[PDB]
């Protein structure tokens, strides 16, 4: 018996705040959280406690500490089959990572629609508000490998596998509403340009290098999604606080056979929130697993990630009523023109048990649709339908990947397909072909119909010649970038300018920076000039005179494109660092901790060492982490209680903690003599917006702090930080 | 509905004789045959009746007859995911075949000991006569591919997977008691020499080619197994009628830790029986699936393959008591010296449901042992231990091949191994390493002990230098070949001479033939002279004077080495062809079928066309096959009843049927006017032993026929066949 | 879509200091640098300038910007074999990364002995001071994936493939002279303990988590290599400024058959130097490719890594 | 991809074209060709866009599909003409 | 034998290298969530060198017991006090 006698090795099977208990496999942490897919996995779940250690063949092992050898100092013998089995399985643990979105974090949950959508789609999972659909969702970055960092600047993937009663539906989306390119034929060119360069394999997790901006400079279609990536969209606070989009126009098909064009949305119920660049970049160093960790811990805490599914719906007759082509994946449909209709809610409420088995082997593909959905001719979507099935043959070892437990449908599946590597299902059908008489033709085809019918494609008219040709309707590149730019707040525009400036400064060939700047001049002059000034480049008279692109269907902004223009802040699940001293004023800490708890905001108690400190009244305060061990990058705000401030007044790490949180625009609250730290961040005596200060933590001190946290960051502090040495 | 109104598409779920019903997956044929392993496969069996046809993702298909195209004569579209999934699975159906033994046929069964063996072994499956152990057995050839023919001249494999309560034990044996070579390092040389030659990949399923005989002539250690292969051992009648052997000395270990050397045997309860060469070779053309079909149909009929497990046991102090080395796998242990102790019975009573999923993916390996067993230093076995684990990484796609349903232990298996391609088991253990405190070190090691203990190697003393050196004690090559030769009947000797003669005639390079004949002269001059004569070679004076090798520990023969020396016939499950005419004497047929039924002998009714014919008394007799459709090759005996013989008397196929049966030494019985056929086989008016004749098919006529059948073939007929042109 | 007229897209094929020129494939940067192994790769090196763009089957492509469709706003057709080859190759680019040392950076070079060692070894690559043996070296971390960061706290790998006249010799060493564990049977237990934990796959490139310290606390044999890992040896400044060791006692065998026990060492001629922890950790975010980059740039500058 | 182990099956010697082949595809299991192109994508400026597309023409031209007229609905339907 | 070579290594380092070793152990063990694991590691450190063990313990808010303070240092390695 190696476990401690007090049982402290084992986390409580109840919801607990981040950091309070060690994290655990979902079925152990939350055994009573269930859904149909989770339950269906029980046949392959393997426990451990009270079982003997064995080989894979079920032979009990006596000594798992030694190889078999001729004498205890002699050579290892080939007959040691226990050693060889154990080392063989180790030697072959790895499988190929995903070609893109290799870095990803996943969870189980469930979806329910708010009302029946039968008037517009026969999809069974949207047919009844009491119909609950298990989901498994993977969030990801795009460029980096499976061992790259979370808080890079990149697009994020948001993939949801819906285990419906009529088959798997996979909605494979991203956190921006468009993509960089128009035709799937170019996807290897684009991806190769953004990925590490082929001679030396650098940089990881970063579009900030020559080949990416070379391609962008030569392919103006990319500029729209580049604007998004350069905005703080490219650096989300959390996968809980980013939007999701299905990228393409698809169709809904109702029982009467009517088709409706649809684009899919996920709205984060926790609000939209992003980091700032210096914070995000430093945090890839201090905690490259920060988003994986934050998701897992939110779910362990009961702060379940919740998203609302929404549809933008366009009638067939309105296909051509926009300035842009609905089938062009570099174009968004502004919500001002076509509102998002709320459809239902998804809650992610349980972590996996084994990350490899459930997360790494999950296969999502946007061709996995169900009756009541269909495709369109969007030429990016069209090529995706080839890729997501092909890629699995190497990644997951063959055509039986749907038998890997996380991938299995909960709906019945029967057909005449046989064999392949790793074949699990043992088919008893006398027949492996149809038509057959020897099994009375079973399993049988099913006509389409209003419910439980066979899949039939919508009979869209095709007419034209066999051509490799881009539609002329796709040939406009600048109006959508411009609409995005004009829709951002002035601080968001600033952060876009700084993203371009930073990225282009890492481009070693200067003519590529110049060429990018020229393209920015075709979008908006103010944007082009501000980036040029940061790169020491001067616009030509001609560039100064490029006329801006047209408005989009008369729009000069759409505030839904901004992260922050319309407040949607939610503090539940956020976290505050509390900087302890060796004699804290216990009444301040009582007021702080209870105020946070009441709003679902977590805390981490930090000091210059581990263990405990004792408050003025004798309360023993447990320390979560050191100032350097849990840097301000990992929190949303910082509070310093009164007490013996001289203990930490001269601690470089403590002061720097405040400087870093200050630079990154985070709310900071200072009680009593903690106000002596005002000198560190240079705060005027009479105070400034975004610094909460009082004689004590009572009264409105916590309310004012929580008000600041609801607005996420103190954007008004931006001119002040500009000169801070931090 | 495509099935016939009368239900005749579906075979009865009851035992039925060969050809009476269409054959069927075993769980449909024999739903109520159960054992722990068959039951445990229920989680993966999939049915079909009354289910809708779907993709693998569970989406119902409406039209499984057409691809999606732009117009009904247009191009196929990339968005046809139903077509691509279906064609993708098809395109990847095949997996690598086994390197050797690729051709094989398998069945489920059970094993039960006759008494407790705890005095000599702690193997749990041998501890009690009540212990029933499920088995899956695969019989195989060695050289040919998975699509090669069954009745080739070759060694056969006989592999048994015991699903014990203490682990999988695989006993991976062959149908001869030795192997061709001494040291595993030469396995690829030997196998490359026997396999099709590398320039042109010829011949399939045959050792009758230059490279095989080249290697043999250069490596006299091969000559013992070569004698077996060249004898009628090389062409068994049926997997039910051959012996099996574990090939190596292994050890039994008992609860006190005492070691006993053991060699394993399987004794076929249907007796020993083989084809003759002409019959076997022609049978590869008429039915290359003959042994696979015969096994499957024997089990369908209730003629379950039964074998008695036998041990030759040698005390540890007796290691050096023979004039050969116990660890030399080109040496057999004569049963006259160490008798076989009969230990239990295995019964094969159910066919698989899906050949690929159960047979093709099954993985046997002789290093799969359990506590109570152990290895020895046999240098062929030692190297096998490496190969059978390594080969599955490509064949079965990775290190989780034990999760392939047929391979799973029924015993518990738990350990800290993780990941690998197509990982099924989802581990919930917080720990993936030991020693660990976080799971209280579970799953835990188990000390060795008398039952349910961990595996510990027998502490054999090793003393010697690190050398690549063959033991001098292995350096004797001719005494065992000679013992084998001297133990054969005169007709078994003639067939061995004929086997060497035929093979060597196919070797193009005549010096290779000459060198092989030189080796034969070192074994037995009579053998050497007879082969030399058929090759047009004359023994030199030196060859004529080679002193024969010594006897084996005083033995100048051992009848246990002969297939036929000691009577061992069983007619149950054999088959007789009955040659019909268009007006059969019903009284003959009634008698024939009644006597055959009483002994469990099957019959096939043959004619010149299909349909039926009508007896003298109006009994309608359904025809099973034509004379050409079901050649005498496929039966054990031929009976021709009386009736309208003029109908068939000048039918060439009918006459030839009897000539071929006659040539291949099969019992023939002729009733009434059927004796007109005596002329086509040149039988004197007064009769001949092995031809049964009478006025009618009375009681005595059938006893005589069945007596011949018990002795398998009419060996006394051999000098008559030279003259028959068939 | 072409190169600038000034030729500034193309790096000079001469040694240049870090940052002065964009970096380039070795055979284009330094085409006059050769050795027997680098030459023998010529059979498979493929250029690009002045060649037509083709499928893998050698068919020239006219339009590499578009899929074949029925009308320019129509569905993509299954007969577009150009699209499907290109996408198929892309869809199958990745192979499994190394179970351990998946993150690593490599270069070509050569080795020669200072004097013949025939008194102690008959190895041909050590027999003559003028026999040059081509090498390929890969430096690595241990725990993290191929896309993890360089300046983590970890042991480093230092693997040299010598292409000798009597066969390949791989000296597969690390930057400390011992290992954590005594018997190979425990390797999967130790590696699983240091690797990201199996429920959530955290942390990448870090032994700072419960399972690693659990294992160490239960297996005191690990303490020696742990001391090395916790020292600044765990955070080298550059692959050029760390020591290498062969980890085990091997044997040398001379022509007379005499065995001598040997342990292998590499001494960095650029000296020993390591970062400090706060700097190493921050550098994993500011430049996760710092060691890869530095090694490439030193070779391009002529600061060739040398080791004794 | 399963039979010959991945997407570099054209590098197996019997499958190799004798014609030139150059493109921006990379990696894959069993990769033989060692690409020296600074670019693995097009369009690119850093290798002056080589290897380059070739217009169709009478000889040594790029492949262009014949511009067959396509007209009808997306159907899973056998032509009556085949019946 | 598990402690003499770690001790030899420790005694061979300069005072600033020793500090960095203390800081590495302290930083790492501060990220170990289960406190008894940190305690057990500090007990192993007390078998190597008490000064090391105390300096780590202090950073982790751990106090060495009397028994731990009394652990006999492992033997020198073949007479060596250090190897630079
Ligand atoms: C709209 C959201 C979106 C878009 C436009 C694309 N990706 Fe994705 N992708 C693969 C191929 C592929 C192609 C051919 C295109 C445009 C033609 C896109 N992508 C753009 C893939 C290589 O087949 C992929 C890699 C592994 C895999 O199974 O599929 C793939 C990944 C991917 C993910 C990750 C899903 C997951 O496994 O967690 C997501 C969210 C996207 N793509 C979104 C996406
Ligand atoms: C004596 C019974 C016996 C003997 C002595 C050998 N084979 Fe077999 N064989 C494999 C390799 C192998 C080696 C290395 C040696 C001597 C060193 C033998 N054989 C002699 C193998 C390549 O690992 C093999 C190929 C597929 C596989 O899984 O293992 C293999 C097959 C095999 C079978 C087939 C079992 C089955 O799949 O049905 C049998 C019955 C034998 N060997 C018997 C055997
Ligand atoms: S998209
Ligand atoms: S054997
Ligand atoms: S080592």
Name the token pair of A294. Answer: 């934050």
**How far is it, in rounded angstroms, from Cα C128 to Cα B284?**
63
User: Reduced to 3 states, what is the DSSP secondary structure of residue C107?
Assistant: strand
Within a domain: B583: yes
Q: Is the peptide bond before D51 cis (omega within 30 degrees of 0)?
A: yes
**How far is it, in rounded angstroms, from Cα E63 to Cα B539?**
95
Give the domain extent around A604. Answer: 573-726
DSSP secondary structure of C114-164:
SS--TTT---GGGS-TT--EEEEEEEE-SSS-TTS-SSSSS--EEEEEEEE
Name the token pair of B219. Answer: 């490596």
| Pair (A534, A586) in one structural domain | no
Q: Provide the CATH number for the domain around residue C98.
A: 2.40.180.10
Report whether residue A172 contacts ligand 1, using a CB cutoff of 6 Å: yes
Given an 8 Å threshold on Cβ–Cβ distance, is C89 in contact with D54? no
Among the listed residues A434, A379, A376, A426, the one whose alpha carbon sits nearest the alpha carbon of residue A403:
A426
Token look-up 């196919």 returns B506
Torsion of CA A123, A129, A134, A140, to 10 degrees: 80
**How far is it, in rounded angstroms, from Cα A137 to Cα A160?**
4
**How far is it, in rounded angstroms, from Cα B558 to Cα C182?**
53
Query: In sequence order, what are the beta bridge partners of C52?
Result: D52
CA distances to A176, A267, A689, C74, D44 from A179, in Å: 8, 19, 39, 19, 20
Which subunits sit against E, judged by 3+ Cβ pairs under 8 A?
A: A, B, C
Within a domain: A68: yes
Within a domain: A12: no
Among the listed residues A195, A170, A138, A152, the one whose alpha carbon sits nearest the alpha carbon of residue A247:
A170
User: Reduced to 3 states, what is the DSSP secondary structure of residue B654?
Assistant: helix
The three-state DSSP-derived secondary structure of B446-487 is CCCCCCCCCECCCCCCCCCCCCCCCCHHHCCCCHHHHHHHHH
How far does the CA of residue C249 sit from the closest CA of chain A (Å)? 13
| Pair (A267, A120) in one structural domain | yes
Residue burial B263-286, b: 16+ Cβ < 10 Å; e: rest: bbbbbbbbbbbbbbbbbbbbbbeb
CB < 8 Å to E36, chain A: 4, 6, 8-9
State the distance between the two ends of chain B, measured CA to CA, in whole angstroms: 49
Residue nearest to atom 15 of ligand 1 (CA): A384
Cβ–Cβ under 8 Å, residues B430 and B438: yes
How far does the CA of residue E50 sit from the closest CA of chain C (Å)? 14
Contacts of residue B346, Cβ cutoff 8 Å, sequence gap at least 6: B109, B110, B111, B135, B137, B160, B266, B306, B307, B308, B309
CA distances to B109, B300, B356 from B289, in Å: 22, 16, 16
Within a domain: C140: yes
**How far is it, in rounded angstroms, from Cα A406 to Cα B682?**
73
Evaluated on CA atoms C173, C177, C179, C183, the torsion sign reads: positive
| Pair (B393, B490) in one structural domain | no
Cβ–Cβ under 8 Å, residues E42 and E65: no
**How far is it, in rounded angstroms, from Cα B371 to Cα B381?**
18
Helix, strand, coil % in chain A, rounded to nearest 5: 30, 20, 50
Between CA A365 and CA A371, with CA A370 as vertex, the angle to 5 degrees is: 155
Q: Where are the beta strands (DSSP E) in B182-297?
A: 244-245, 250-253, 259-268
CB < 8 Å to A628, chain E: 27
CB < 8 Å to A461, chain D: 72-73
Cβ–Cβ under 8 Å, residues A398 and B91: no
Contacts of residue B444, Cβ cutoff 8 Å, sequence gap at least 6: A52, A53, B434
Given an 8 Å threshold on Cβ–Cβ distance, is B434 in contact with A93? no
| Pair (B580, B553) in one structural domain | no
Q: Please name the residue ranges forming H helices in D11-80.
A: none
How much distance in Å is there from the Cα of B303 to the middle of ligand 2? 28
**A402: number of Cβ within 10 Å:** 23
Q: Which of residues 386-445 of B touch E (CB under 8 A)?
A: 437-438
CA distances to B104, B201, B275 from B657, in Å: 29, 35, 17
Residue burial B329-351, b: 16+ Cβ < 10 Å; e: rest: bbbbbbbbbbebeebbbbbbbbb
User: Reduced to 3 states, what is the DSSP secondary structure of residue B222?
Assistant: helix
Cβ–Cβ under 8 Å, residues C28 and D27: no
Angle, in degrees to the nearest 10, between helices B210-218 and B510-521: 40
**Does the CB of A623 have a partner CB in chain E at under 8 Å?**
yes
Cβ–Cβ under 8 Å, residues A413 and B57: yes
**How far is it, in rounded angstroms, from Cα A348 to Cα B276?**
70
Within a domain: C41: yes
**How far is it, in rounded angstroms, from Cα B256 to Cα B405?**
36
Cβ–Cβ under 8 Å, residues C230 and E25: yes
The three-state DSSP-derived secondary structure of A177-203 is CCCCCCCHHHHHHHHHHHCCCCCCCCC
Query: Radius of gyration over alpha carbons of chain D, in Å?
Result: 19
**How far is it, in rounded angstroms, from Cα B670 to Cα B303?**
27
What is the distance, to the nearest Å, from the Cα of residue A172 to the centroid of all Cα atoms in its chain? 12
**B152: number of Cβ within 10 Å:** 26
In a 13 Å sphere around the CA of B266, the CA atoms on its Cβ side amount to: 30
Instruction: Name the catalytic one among A35, A108, A174, A265.
Output: A174
Residue burial B182-198, b: 16+ Cβ < 10 Å; e: rest: bbbebbeebbebbbbee
**How far is it, in rounded angstroms, from Cα B213 to Cα B203?**
13
Q: How far is it between the farthest Cα atoms of chain D? A: 57
Residue to mutate, A144, A185, A388, A391, ligand 1, most ligand atoms under 8 Å from C-beta:
A388
Total number of residues shown for chain B: 726
CA distances to A271, A529, A663, B648 from B619, in Å: 88, 106, 105, 19
Q: Are strands B612-614 and B620-622 parallel, antiparallel or unpaired?
A: antiparallel
Which numbered ligand comes closest to the C-alpha of A225?
A: 3
Between CA C290 and CA C297, with CA C295 as vertex, the angle to 5 degrees is: 95
The question of whether A101 is a catalytic residue gets the answer: yes
Report whether residue C181 contacts ligand 5, using a CB cutoff of 6 Å: no
CA distances to A289, A330, B652, B657 from B660, in Å: 78, 79, 12, 5
Within a domain: B420: no
Which subunits sit against D, judged by 3+ Cβ pairs under 8 A?
A: A, B, C
Residue nearest to atom 1 of ligand 3 (CA): A247
Q: Where are the beta strands (DSSP E) in A571-633?
A: 575-579, 602-607, 612-614, 620-622, 625-626
Q: A550, A572, A594 — which closes off a domain?
A: A572
Among the listed residues B322, B312, B218, B220, the one whose alpha carbon sits nearest the alpha carbon of residue B550:
B322
Residue nearest to atom 22 of ligand 2 (CA): B99
How far does the CA of residue D66 sit from the closest CA of chain A (Å)? 7
CB < 8 Å to E30, chain A: 610, 625-626, 629
Token look-up 């149809």 returns A434
Query: Radius of gyration over alpha carbons of chain A, in Å?
Result: 28
What is the distance, to the nearest Å, from the Cα of residue C81 to the centroid of all Cα atoms in its chain? 36
Q: B409, B439, B459 — which closes off a domain?
A: B409
**How far is it, in rounded angstroms, from Cα E76 to Cα E84?**
15
| Pair (A405, A297) in one structural domain | yes
How much distance in Å is there from the Cα of A246 to the middle of ligand 3? 7
How far does the CA of residue C40 sit from the closest CA of chain A (Å)? 19
Whether A contacts B, i.e. 3 or more CB pairs less than 8 A apart, is yes
How many domains does chain A contain in total?
A: 3
What is the distance, to the nearest Å, from the Cα of residue C245 to the centroid of all Cα atoms in its chain? 17
Contacts of residue B39, Cβ cutoff 8 Å, sequence gap at least 6: none
Cβ–Cβ under 8 Å, residues A426 and B353: yes
DSSP secondary structure of A22-41:
----HHHH-TT---HHHHHG
Q: Give resolution, Å, one decimal.
A: 1.8
Given an 8 Å threshold on Cβ–Cβ distance, is A426 in contact with B88? no
The three-state DSSP-derived secondary structure of A670-709 is EEHHHHHHHHHHCCCCCCCCCEEEECCCCCCHHHHHHHHH
Q: Provide the CATH number for the domain around residue A501.
A: 1.20.1370.20
Between CA B540 and CA B547, with CA B542 as vertex, the angle to 5 degrees is: 125
Which numbered ligand comes closest to the C-alpha of C176?
A: 5
How much distance in Å is there from the Cα of B155 to the middle of ligand 4? 11
Cβ–Cβ under 8 Å, residues B232 and B495: yes
Cβ–Cβ under 8 Å, residues B215 and B222: yes
Token look-up 């917080």 returns B430
Cβ–Cβ under 8 Å, residues A207 and A154: yes
Q: B409, B427, B444 — which closes off a domain?
A: B409
Within a domain: B8: no
Q: What is the DSSP letter of A561?
A: G
Which of the residues D9, D27, D45, D50 would you substitute to probe the A interface, choosing the one with the greatest number of A C-beta atoms within 10 Å? Answer: D45
| Pair (B592, B622) in one structural domain | yes
Helix, strand, coil % in chain C, rounded to nearest 5: 30, 20, 55
Among the listed residues C239, C266, C211, C268, the one whose alpha carbon sits nearest the alpha carbon of residue C103:
C239
Name the token pair of B595. Answer: 């006597």
Query: Taking CA atoms, what residue in B is nearest to C83?
Result: B78
The question of whether B199 is a catalytic residue gets the answer: no
DSSP secondary structure of chain E:
--SHHHHHHHHTS-HHHHHHHHHHHHHHHHT-SSHHHHHHHHHHHHTT-HHHHHHHHHHTT----HHHHTPPPPPPBTTBS---
Given an 8 Å threshold on Cβ–Cβ distance, is A462 in contact with D71? yes
Given an 8 Å threshold on Cβ–Cβ distance, is A426 in contact with B41? yes
| Pair (B506, B654) in one structural domain | no
Given an 8 Å threshold on Cβ–Cβ distance, is D70 in contact with B74? yes
Which of the residues C210, C214, C215, C217 would you substitute to probe the E interface, choosing the one with the greatest number of E C-beta atoms within 10 Å? Answer: C217
Query: Taking CA atoms, what residue in D is nearest to B70?
Result: D74
Query: Radius of gyration over alpha carbons of chain E, in Å?
Result: 13
Cβ–Cβ under 8 Å, residues A232 and A175: no
| Pair (B56, B101) in one structural domain | yes
Within a domain: B692: yes
Q: What is the DSSP letter of A223?
A: H
Instruction: Name the catalytic one among C9, C174, C192, C254.
Output: C174
The burial class, CB within 10 Å (0-12 / 13-18 / 19+), for C13 is middle
Evaluated on CA atoms D59, D63, D64, D65, the torsion sign reads: positive
Report whether residue B172 contacts ligand 2, using a CB cutoff of 6 Å: yes
Residue nearest to atom 1 of ligand 4 (CA): B247
**How far is it, in rounded angstroms, from Cα A198 to Cα A210?**
12
Which numbered ligand comes closest to the C-alpha of A328?
A: 3
Instruction: Name the catalytic one among C9, C56, C101, C254.
Output: C101
| Pair (B174, B89) in one structural domain | yes
Which of the residues D7, D74, D77, D78 would you substitute to probe the A interface, choosing the one with the greatest number of A C-beta atoms within 10 Å? Answer: D74
Q: Provide the CATH number for the domain around residue A670.
A: 3.40.50.880
CB < 8 Å to E62, chain C: none
CA distances to A248, A453, B13 from B108, in Å: 53, 40, 17
Name the token pair of A284. Answer: 């890839």
B478 belongs to an annotated ligand binding site? no
**How far is it, in rounded angstroms, from Cα A349 to Cα A239?**
14
Q: Are strands D34-35 and C45-46 parallel, antiparallel or unpaired?
A: parallel
**Does the CB of C211 have a partner CB in chain B at under 8 Å?**
yes
| Pair (B121, B234) in one structural domain | yes
| Pair (B497, B593) in one structural domain | no
Cβ–Cβ under 8 Å, residues C173 and C248: no
Which numbered ligand comes closest to the C-alpha of A105?
A: 1
CA distances to A548, A554, B453 from A476, in Å: 12, 16, 75
| Pair (A560, A584) in one structural domain | no
Name the token pair of B664. Answer: 């291949």
The burial class, CB within 10 Å (0-12 / 13-18 / 19+), for B601 is buried
């Amino acid at each position: 018996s190696l476990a401690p006698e007090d049982g402290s090795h084992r986390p409580a099977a109840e919801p607990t705040p981040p950091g309070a208990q060690p994290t655990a496999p979902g079925s152990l942490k939350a055994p009573d959280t269930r859904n149909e897919k989770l339950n269906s996995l029980e046949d392959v779940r393997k426990g451990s406690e009270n079982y003997a250690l064995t080989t894979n063949q079920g032979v009990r092992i006596a000594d798992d500490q030694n190889s078999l050898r001729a004498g205890s100092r002699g050579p290892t013998l080939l007959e040691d089959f226990i050693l060889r089995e154990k080392i063989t399985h180790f030697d072959h643990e790895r499988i190929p990572e995903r070609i893109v979105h290799a870095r990803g974090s996943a969870a189980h949950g469930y979806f329910q629609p708010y009302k029946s959508l039968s008037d517009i789609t026969k999809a069974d999972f949207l047919s009844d508000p009491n119909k609950i659909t298990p989901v498994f969702v993977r969030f990801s970055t795009v460029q980096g490998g499976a061992g790259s960092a979370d808080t890079v600047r990149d697009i994020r993937g948001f993939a949801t596998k819906f285990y419906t009663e009529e088959g798997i539906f996979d909605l494979v989306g991203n956190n921006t509403p468009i993509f960089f390119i128009q035709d799937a034929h170019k996807f290897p060119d684009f991806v190769h340009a953004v990925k590490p360069e082929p001679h030396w394999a650098i940089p990881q997790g970063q579009s900030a290098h020559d080949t990416f901006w070379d391609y962008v400079s030569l392919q103006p279609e990319t500029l729209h999604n580049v604007m998004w990536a350069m905005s703080d969209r490219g650096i989300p606070r959390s996968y809980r606080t980013m939007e999701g989009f299905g990228c393409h126009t698809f169709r809904l098909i109702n029982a009467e056979g009517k088709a409706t064009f649809v684009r899919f949305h996920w709205k984060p119920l926790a609000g939209k929130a992003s980091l700032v660049w210096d914070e995000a970049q430093k945090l890839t160093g201090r905690d490259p697993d920060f988003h994986r960790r934050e998701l897992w811990e939110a779910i362990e805490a009961g702060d379940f990630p919740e998203y609302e599914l929404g549809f933008q719906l366009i009638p067939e007759e309105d296909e051509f009523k926009f300035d842009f082509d609905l089938l062009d994946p570099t174009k968004l449909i502004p919500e001002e023109l076509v509102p998002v209709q709320r459809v239902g809610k998804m809650v992610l409420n349980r972590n996996p048990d084994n990350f490899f088995a459930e997360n790494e082997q999950a296969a999502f593909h946007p061709g996995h649709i169900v009756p009541g959905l269909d495709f369109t001719n969007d030429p990016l979507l069209q090529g995706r339908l080839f890729s997501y099935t092909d890629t699995q043959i190497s990644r997951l070892g063959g055509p039986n990947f749907h038998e890997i437990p996380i991938n299995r449908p909960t709906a019945p599946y029967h057909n005449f397909q046989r064999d392949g590597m790793h074949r699990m299902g043992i088919d008893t059908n006398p027949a492996n072909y149809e038509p057959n008489s020897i099994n009375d033709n079973w399993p049988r085809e099913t006509p389409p119909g209003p419910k439980r019918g066979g899949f039939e494609s919508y009979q869209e008219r095709v007419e034209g010649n066999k051509v490799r040709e881009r539609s002329p309707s796709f040939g406009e590149y600048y109006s959508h970038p411009r609409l995005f730019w004009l829709s951002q707040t002035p601080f968001e525009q600033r952060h876009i300018v700084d993203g371009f400036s930073f990225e282009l400064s890492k481009v070693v060939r200067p003519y590529i920076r110049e060429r990018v700047v020229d393209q920015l001049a075709h979008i908006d002059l103010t944007l082009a000039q501000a980036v040029a000034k940061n790169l020491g480049i001067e616009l030509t008279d001609d560039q100064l005179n490029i006329t801006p692109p047209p408005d989009v269907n008369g729009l000069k902004k759409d505030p839904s494109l901004s992260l922050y223009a319309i407040p949607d802040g939610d503090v539940k699940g956020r976290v505050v660092a509390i900087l302890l001293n060796d004699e804290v004023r216990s009444a301040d800490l009582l007021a702080i901790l209870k105020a946070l708890k009441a709003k679902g905001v977590h805390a981490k108690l930090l000091y210059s060492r581990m263990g405990e400190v004792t408050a003025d009244d004798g309360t023993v305060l447990p320390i979560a982490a050191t100032f350097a061990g849990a840097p301000s990058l990992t929190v949303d705000a910082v509070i310093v209680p009164a007490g013996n401030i001289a203990d930490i007044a001269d601690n470089g790490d403590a002061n720097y903690y405040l400087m870093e949180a200050y630079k990154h625009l985070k709310p900071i609250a200072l009680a009593g003599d903690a106000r002596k730290f005002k000198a560190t961040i240079k705060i005027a005596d009479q105070g400034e917006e975004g610094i909460v200060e009082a004689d004590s933590a009572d009264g409105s001190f916590m309310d004012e702090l929580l008000t600041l946290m609801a607005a996420h960051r103190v954007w008004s502090r931006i001119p002040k930080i500009d000169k801070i040495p931090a």
